[PDB]
Amino acid sequence: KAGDWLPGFTPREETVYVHGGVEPDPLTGAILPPIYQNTTFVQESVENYLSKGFSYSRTSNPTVLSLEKKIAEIEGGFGACCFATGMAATVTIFSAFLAPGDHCLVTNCSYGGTNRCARLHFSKYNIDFEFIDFRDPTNVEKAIRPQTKVVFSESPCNPTLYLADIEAISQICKEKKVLHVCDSTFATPYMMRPLDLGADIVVQSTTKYYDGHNCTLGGAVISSTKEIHDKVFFLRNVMGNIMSAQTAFYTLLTLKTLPIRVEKQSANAQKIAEFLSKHHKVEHVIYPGIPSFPQKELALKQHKNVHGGMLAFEVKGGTEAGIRMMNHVPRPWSLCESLGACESIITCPAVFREDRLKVGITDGFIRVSVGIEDVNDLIDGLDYALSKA
Amino acid sequence: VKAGDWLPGFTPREETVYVHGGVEPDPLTGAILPPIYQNTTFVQESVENYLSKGFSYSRTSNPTVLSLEKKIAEIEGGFGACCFATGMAATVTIFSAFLAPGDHCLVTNCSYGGTNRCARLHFSKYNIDFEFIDFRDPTNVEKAIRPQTKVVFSESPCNPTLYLADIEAISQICKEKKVLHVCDSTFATPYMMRPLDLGADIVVQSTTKYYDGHNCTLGGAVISSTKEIHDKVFFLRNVMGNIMSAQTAFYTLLTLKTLPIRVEKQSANAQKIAEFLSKHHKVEHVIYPGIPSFPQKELALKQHKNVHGGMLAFEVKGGTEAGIRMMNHVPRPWSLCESLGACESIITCPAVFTHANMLREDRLKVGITDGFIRVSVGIEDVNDLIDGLDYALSKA
Amino acid sequence: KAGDWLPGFTPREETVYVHGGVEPDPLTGAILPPIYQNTTFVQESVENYLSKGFSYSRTSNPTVLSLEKKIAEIEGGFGACCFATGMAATVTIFSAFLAPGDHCLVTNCSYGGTNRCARLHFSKYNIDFEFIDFRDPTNVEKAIRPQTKVVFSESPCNPTLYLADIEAISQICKEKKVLHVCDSTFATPYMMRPLDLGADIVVQSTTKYYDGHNCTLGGAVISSTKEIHDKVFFLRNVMGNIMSAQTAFYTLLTLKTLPIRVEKQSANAQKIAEFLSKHHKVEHVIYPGIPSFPQKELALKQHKNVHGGMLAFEVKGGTEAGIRMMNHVPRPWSLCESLGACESIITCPAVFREDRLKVGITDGFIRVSVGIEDVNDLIDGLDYALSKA
Amino acid sequence: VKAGDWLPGFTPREETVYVHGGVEPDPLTGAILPPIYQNTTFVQESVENYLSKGFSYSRTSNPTVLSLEKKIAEIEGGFGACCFATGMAATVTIFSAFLAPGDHCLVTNCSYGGTNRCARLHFSKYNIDFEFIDFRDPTNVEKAIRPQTKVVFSESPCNPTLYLADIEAISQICKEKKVLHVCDSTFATPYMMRPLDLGADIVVQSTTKYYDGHNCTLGGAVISSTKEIHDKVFFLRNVMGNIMSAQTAFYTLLTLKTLPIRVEKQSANAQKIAEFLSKHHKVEHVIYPGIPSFPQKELALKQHKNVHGGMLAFEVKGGTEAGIRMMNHVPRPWSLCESLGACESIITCPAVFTHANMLREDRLKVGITDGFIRVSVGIEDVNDLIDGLDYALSKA
Ligand SMILES: *Cc1c(COP(=O)(O)O)cnc(C)c1O
Ligand SMILES: *Cc1c(COP(=O)(O)O)cnc(C)c1O
Ligand SMILES: *Cc1c(COP(=O)(O)O)cnc(C)c1O
Ligand SMILES: *Cc1c(COP(=O)(O)O)cnc(C)c1O
């Protein structure tokens, strides 16, 4: 009847982004879930405690739970836990699955915050973090110790856009009985679902593409099994780092357009990468959709639908040229941190060294987050900025 | 030219305006989205610099609402815009500002039901004569204009029959006869049709529908062609206390950024659904401005840019019983409910849901038949949407 | 049992402010009502249309309806309708109950907006508005015509704080079969409930005291009968001027503290009025709690609990002195419009004439909205401002 | 001195600080409440003026959150404050920043259950030794300090037994032995007790409870006595990603304005309820710091300003069965649920609701008995509250 999914059918991809994890409010029929902006939940009696499923919003909240169900469906997981930020999701992984004496392999071109929270904080608990090059899966295979509990990949990596072969790394981790965690923030599940490729856990900064509007901060942990999910949920309650109901409402809203947003962003990004690869003031361009991409074979194997909204490039002249460019990049570009949004964002990490170069972050390196503006405004602005470099 | 400046002498392209129009980073903090001014009153520096920072009281104007207004005026091509609590409040403010006892007002006879009602049931008690006519032929409008006519109120496409009105032709008639042309282009969106570009004097929008597009907020907008019209609307909005709230304006500032890609996806889905329905052996008629049998095809091709919209309609064979049974059996992802324009596909019967206070005889005279079904297409996978309709039609 | 009011008992005053019109969410037990930030409501079938009570948020919304039930209980009415602003509530009254040829009596010292929306707008529909002095009920009795449909009182009046004898005016209106509408925004229902005194309709700007935090705009119409309530509700749907769910949530929150807020504000106001009445630069002080108040007998008859947070005074020296004072009133005072808030507000209407004087608004007249700051900071600041006058 | 300025050389009085602390009218518009910065990232003018307007990314700092932080630091009497998603996140950030393998940490054995758990169940796996002792006698703390002790974590009053700890005496001991004194004064609020005034090094607050006081938001705060401590907390908050959101900070900026009058009303109600319970023939024991039989009366009178708080506890005669029956029969306006501090009066059994993972033997050793009932008093009419309790007690 009306209001039911037909039994035995599974919604197709875009339908899940619109409707996944949500049904009309049973009480009123409201098409969107109400915002449970409240801390505590009244119990019918001492015996029917938790009979309606909730007690305290630090532990679980109905709006947050609806978003978690949607995210788990989109990523292909058993369940998801939502957090105040992406960093909270990551540090909850490190907190739950590592103890003194354990070993953790982390991609050496990881997002800066992940790298720092490993080196500067968790390492003081006598946890051994080792940073290696994930572009070759045999590097991971050869670096796993008996003490290794977690292999933490990221693909594409921030900011260099290196790819990690998630299926091969997952095979390696399964054989060694090690947890494979994948940060696929830059990919989004519309381009790559690491759980489909054998990862044990996915970490998402929902701040970036899930939101996509520069509106909220948020994080998510999607677990492949009930055992892992239960561990994450328990520790989230202890750490007090759950997402708020209002943030979950915003993200429930913005996730509905993730497919059409990422399609537009990636079409723009392809055109911008093609323009930059012919510009005489540009030394190198990094985009998984152009022929110069070093890991083109893996990109064709691992990416679905698109090649994403992120790109990078190196301006000729080094740091001084990159600075001149950044200082003269006009609207509609925004000069700032973050990525994944409707508003195109550009930044030069160097201005905002030996180890920097060891990563791949060269002096004139520019990270570009492509939005959904008209691509001719974006290209015209980059062309003008380059004329000052 | 430095970071934070636009290139001088360039007009930003359309999609850029949807993302950035009316909005710059916060001067104080650089926040990429301007903050929500969730506050009622504004402190003044002194008596002599009263209103020197531009604001006094949020019923009169609010900074978040004003940012949204500048963006909407830019998108619709107007001098200025006023934002309201609902689309109906926008419409009522136009009737309140531009009509007085003794005046005559031509309204499309297939107007959105609420417009028809607030005219017939409320403003008519002030001895304003509302005449409801067929706007499909602009000469009907020309020769229905009496010397008391002050306002011509068109809608295109019409809710729910999707009749079109030739906005450019009607505006030429209205300028010749010195009458105000107001056009409700809620169903079109400015991505498909901008009445101000076609000579209308005022545009009214229910931002509830496509501007929002997420079933999240209520809102309305009036976009005025001139400063004289805009100032009248603004003054009366302050008197009637029906301004939009800062929080609603923040939501709409956010959702408007994706209006082009949303409407493109909705319209692509709607074309495929209308083709599917037009071949279906249990469907009597299909109405969609983009299918080749559309009766006003030539006007649609003249007046619609990019797309033919997310709205369609159809009649199921068998009359009322079959339409009711089809409604009761349409599965998810469809939603059975009122409203339209949203990411979530919606289906309804205008006979019960919206045009219920229109007596059946007039209901039919309009075009709202027994088996008539209004469809608002969202952005789900079109194959899920068609699967659901095909199941419901097989049950009908 | 737990979760039930005991049958046959009525909650006392302050309990209604905390809990009136609201019960824990039946679905989850959430102690606060969820925010129904949604426009439309899914229907079970064509036959069970409106079976769950909602269809479209312009017509009715669950959060708004909870607030309406609370407000109706607090004011002692059959029902309430909530609006985007106080002015929307007022203009809905004028729209619903007046037609060409009708006559409307309005207090001549009404809030400026009410006066203007009558004179400048509704008068163009051939509605005859007559402004008279409501301090004497026999003025109302003698001014009622056969065409009179509405008598619109306000007590205390903005800004002069004149009182209207609501019970006597109601008796007069009942005998003439005329609708008595009362704007009791300045009083709040904690000090005066016009429905208890025989008024037919109450109008509230919830912006002022119901909110009390300078946070939201809002309005309410509380009707004494189902017939009146139904008329107001129908026209609200036509006018499209309903309150939003988010605003209703804020007001559901802030109404809980209205009694303790108004108690503190009124204690401060009494002390400030006593200070000003001894200051040599102050010509007159207007406060219903000091002995100089002209309508002291009516204030003692008509006011409950307190004498309110509003006061007024005239500085010696006229307009120039008032301006000097306003320009030198220090924090914690705020120089701005509105009233009723935690933050003390001061304004001089003259700077921000014959008819002005006809009202009672003299040149050096200052309207003071007392907040909940420490009264010694407030008095010290007024003393300093006066030293510049 | 002009409008918008404070009088120079005057310290604003306490209630004024609750209304206005940390907040001035918006410089750009004069908005009396500063807007909600609902945005993630902040645009920079150039490379060389990076962070010149003070913000870059909302995980690190946000303008609305920073306004709330300045207000909280002013109210609690600290150098600075950091705001967090929850009280538990504040507490966990303190344990994460100031403890390392091999360190010893003295915690009150009647600490709030979540604190006890995150110590025992999580941080202990890093080879941090948490020792749980009786803080009612400060010499217990003095002689329990081992040379590995880095942190002494007190709570007063304790959740749920309402035991007090002599904050000034414990701080003197901690300064003599060069150990960090952290105090959770959630149950007290700064209106009743400011641990930083009494020599504590750090205060931790669950703003969820009384700062909010309306059951609306979750939140936490860490208030630091010095710049060195504050900078450590701020740095680690950015690493752990547990900052408060702008919307929650806006809500708390609003609710904090009424904290004094709320706590005054709650505390007046609570005194009357505790007196009523102490005379009731079906009540075994009543615990409230303001009734004359309170065991730590002298410390309460030394350490509590204005009030003795909204929290009380009692045991019903008959043990577990009678307590359960009383719970199942307490009517509205009471609410049966977790949490505390709110306008809405709340009642619960810590045995099931909060301290359930504490085994019964330890449960009793603490003071959490079978018939033990924790009561959070709101601002309803006290006669309705007493009526409800009297009915429930008659059913017990
Ligand atoms: C942004 C980012 C993070 C951190 O998420 P936050 O929401 O900023 O805390 C983690 N991983 C990647 C790849 C990121 O881009
Ligand atoms: C929805 C609608 C309106 C009324 O707008 P509301 O936001 O519902 O008040 C007006 N015109 C059209 C064409 C509509 O569809
Ligand atoms: C403020 C006010 C109004 C108008 O209410 P708004 O919410 O500002 O539209 C009406 N009556 C009185 C007495 C007022 O003070
Ligand atoms: C509530 C509570 C906490 C934990 O705070 P949350 O906001 O629930 O994370 C800490 N200490 C005390 C005394 C508490 O009552």
Widest pairwise Cα distance in chain D: 74
How far from each other are the two terminal CA atoms of chain D, in whole angstroms?
Answer: 64
Q: What residues contact residue C183 under an 8 Å CB cut-off, 6+ apart?
A: C90, C110, C111, C114, C152, C153, C154, C155, C202, C203, C204, C205
Considering CB atoms only, which of A2, A35, A40 is closest to C34?
Answer: A35
β-pairing verdict for C334-335 and C219-223: unpaired
Ligand 1 midpoint to CA A109 (Å) = 13
Alpha carbons C169 and C175: distance in angstroms, whole number:
10
Q: Are A71 and A21 in contact (CB under 8 A)?
A: yes
What are residue C205's DSSP bridge partners?
Answer: C219
Interface check B11 vs D, CB under 8 A:
no
In D124-219, at which residue ranges do the beta strands (DSSP E only) sit? Answer: 129-133, 149-155, 180-184, 202-206
One DSSP character per residue, B74-102 reads: HHHT-SEEEEESSHHHHHHHHHHHH--TT
Of A89, A159, A193, A183, whose CA–CA distance to A314 is shortest? A159
Q: Are D333 and D385 in contact (CB under 8 A)?
A: yes
β-pairing verdict for B80-84 and A334-335: unpaired
Q: Which residues of B touch A217 (CB under 8 A)?
A: none
One DSSP character per residue, D223-263 reads: EESSHHHHHHHHHHHHHHT-BPPHHHHHHHHHHGGGHHHHH
**Residue B319: left (phi > 0), alpha (psi -120 to 50), or beta?**
left
C-alpha distance from residue A10 to each of A19, A74, A196, B177, B378 (Å): 12, 12, 16, 59, 18
Q: What are phi and psi of A223, to 5 degrees?
A: -105, 140
Tell me the two tokens of residue A97: 């699955």
Q: Residue C129, SS3?
A: strand
Is A337 close to D56, i.e. CB distance below 8 A?
Answer: yes
Q: Are D183 and D167 in contact (CB under 8 A)?
A: yes
Alpha carbons A173 and A139: distance in angstroms, whole number:
12
Helix (H) or strand (E) holding C178: none
Q: Which residues of A touch B216 (CB under 8 A)?
A: 32, 253
Helix (H) or strand (E) holding D65: helix D63-76
Alpha carbons B365 and C97: distance in angstroms, whole number:
33
Question: Is D191 annotated for ligand binding?
Answer: no
Q: Are C328 and C386 in contact (CB under 8 A)?
A: no
Q: What residues contact residue A388 under an 8 Å CB cut-off, 6+ apart?
A: A324, A325, A327, A328
Order of strands across the sheet that contains D372-376: D283-287, D311-316, D372-376, D346-348, D335-336
Q: Which ligand is nearest to the Cα of residue A188, counting in written order? A: 1
B/C interface, count of CB pairs below 8 Å: 192
Determine which residue's CA is closest to atom 6 belonging to ligand 2: B87
**Single-letter residue type at C87:** M
User: At CA A265, angle to CA B263 and CA A333, rounded to 5?
Assistant: 105
How far from each other are the two terminal CA atoms of chain C, in whole angstroms?
Answer: 63
Tell me the two tokens of residue C38: 């949604």
Alpha carbons C66 and C46: distance in angstroms, whole number:
26
**Single-letter residue type at B314:** F
Alpha carbons D234 and D94: distance in angstroms, whole number:
11
Place of tokens 């009791």: C184
Torsion sign across C-alpha atoms D352, D357, D361, D367? negative
Alpha carbons C363 and C319: distance in angstroms, whole number:
5
Is D239 close to A84, i.e. CB distance below 8 A?
Answer: no
Considering CB atoms only, which of C2, C372, C381 is closest to D329?
Answer: C2
Alpha carbons B344 and D280: distance in angstroms, whole number:
59
Q: What residues contact residue C384 under an 8 Å CB cut-off, 6+ apart?
A: C328, C329, C330, D1, D7
Of D254, D312, D265, D248, whose CA–CA distance to D285 is shortest? D312
As for ligand 3, residues whose beta carbon falls within 6 Å of it are B 59, 241; C 85-87, 111, 113, 154, 158, 183, 185-186, 205, 207-208, 217, 219
Q: Residue A366, SS3?
A: strand
β-pairing verdict for D129-133 and B104-108: unpaired
Q: Are D203 and D195 in contact (CB under 8 A)?
A: yes
Is A41 close to C52, i.e. CB distance below 8 A?
Answer: no
Determine which residue's CA is closest to atom 7 belonging to ligand 2: B87
As for ligand 4, residues whose beta carbon falls within 6 Å of it are A 58, 240; D 86-88, 112, 114, 155, 159, 184, 186-187, 206, 208-209, 218, 220
Q: Are D311 and D273 in contact (CB under 8 A)?
A: no
Alpha carbons A366 and A326: distance in angstroms, whole number:
9
Residue D200 DSSP code: -
Q: What residues contact residue D178 under an 8 Å CB cut-off, 6+ apart?
A: none
**Alpha helix locations (H) across chain B?**
14-20, 63-76, 87-98, 113-117, 138-144, 167-177, 227-240, 246-255, 259-278, 297-303, 319-328, 350-353, 360-366, 382-395
One DSSP character per residue, C28-97 reads: T-BSSPPB---SBB--S-STTTTTTS-SBTTT--HHHHHHHHHHHHHHT-SEEEEESSHHHHHHHHHHHH
B86 lines ligand 2 (CB under 6 A): yes
Task: For an interface test with A, give the residue of D38, D39, D61, D86 to mutate (most A CBs within 10 A).
Answer: D86
The approach used to solve this structure was: X-ray
Alpha carbons D364 and D370: distance in angstroms, whole number:
8
Q: Are C58 and B86 in contact (CB under 8 A)?
A: yes
Q: Residue C374, SS3?
A: coil
A85 lines ligand 1 (CB under 6 A): yes
